[PDB]
Design a protein around this ligand. Structure first.
Ligand SMILES: NS(O)(O)c1ccc(OCc2cn(-c3ccccc3)nn2)cc1
Ligand SMILES: [Zn+2]
Length: 258
């Protein structure tokens, strides 16, 4: 009886195995745009993905991860609210069963169809496992998805999904360029938070871009054909793999833009 996104194992149950679920800096949160304050001291984001080396794509039973070679400073995130260098390890998405839900963060209570998380770890801690034990261990760049025009740079991801339909399946996924998933603007909100899945560790500096990317209905429909289950098990569609907004508590969300 492991955690998931069903009625009997979903987000409202997680606290029983992971008491930090009710902690002081949990994610995601609602971003109240009128309360978020412009912070002129915040720097522009530095997203350096030109040397990114993708390796593999994995259905882990709660989403799919596109994994990168993080044994050197290839693809890194710096600047903004961050001190030091954060290495890209993987990206994944959260999405809904319908276009009107799927994102984890919300903006003035608006839910987007999906949310992309580019996960980076602070290289002062040496490896990812050590980094998640630190309050400034990770930086996750969050990007909203809305349904409209297709995102050409997403299609290579979409088309490999039939080969990793079920939990535990992986496929080679080399030479994928994550720059093709970014929006035009790097304007962002930032706040201190947590992993949005168990173990829910409070180790993340969240950087959530204001500008959503557009993906087509056909693209998101292919996300929704994935399975939570393993091969040969009763089919349960991988949809609604998002945690709802958590209490903001003693936190301020800062904006990089006026
Ligand atoms: N959704 S999110 O972007 O917040 C997000 C990002 C990263 C996550 O990592 C889970 C994880 C894996 N490990 C681990 C550590 C050492 C060895 C093996 C696994 N620890 N936490 C979860 C959610
Ligand atoms: Zn995530």
């Amino acid at each position: 009886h492991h955690w998931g996104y069903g009625k009997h194992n979903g987000p409202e149950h997680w606290h029983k195995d992971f008491p930090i679920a009710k902690g002081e800096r949990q994610s995601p949160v609602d971003i109240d745009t009128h309360t978020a304050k412009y912070d002129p001291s915040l720097k522009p984001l530095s997203v350096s993905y030109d040397q990114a080396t993708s390796l593999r794509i994995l259905n882990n039973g709660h989403a799919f991860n596109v994994e990168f070679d993080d044994s050197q400073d290839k693809a890194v995130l710096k600047g903004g609210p961050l001190d030091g260098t954060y290495r890209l390890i993987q990206f994944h998405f959260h999405w809904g069963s319908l276009d009107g839900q799927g994102s984890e963060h919300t903006v003035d209570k608006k839910k987007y169809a999906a949310e992309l998380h580019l996960v980076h770890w602070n290289t002062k801690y040496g490896d990812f496992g050590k980094a998640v034990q630190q309050p400034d261990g990770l930086a996750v760049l969050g990007i909203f998805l809305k349904v409209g025009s297709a995102k050409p740079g997403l299609q290579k991801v979409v088309d490999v999904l039939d080969s990793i339909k079920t939990k535990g399946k992986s496929a080679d996924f080399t030479n994928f360029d994550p720059r093709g998933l970014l929006p035009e603007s790097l304007d962002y909100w930032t706040y201190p938070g947590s992993l949005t899945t168990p173990p829910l560790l409070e180790c993340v500096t969240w950087i959530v871009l204001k500008e959503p990317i557009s993906v087509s209905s056909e693209q998101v429909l292919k996300f929704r054909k994935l399975n939570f289950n393993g091969e040969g098990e009763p089919e349960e569609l991988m949809v609604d793999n998002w945690r709802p907004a958590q209490p903001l508590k003693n936190r301020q969300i800062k904006a990089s833009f006026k």
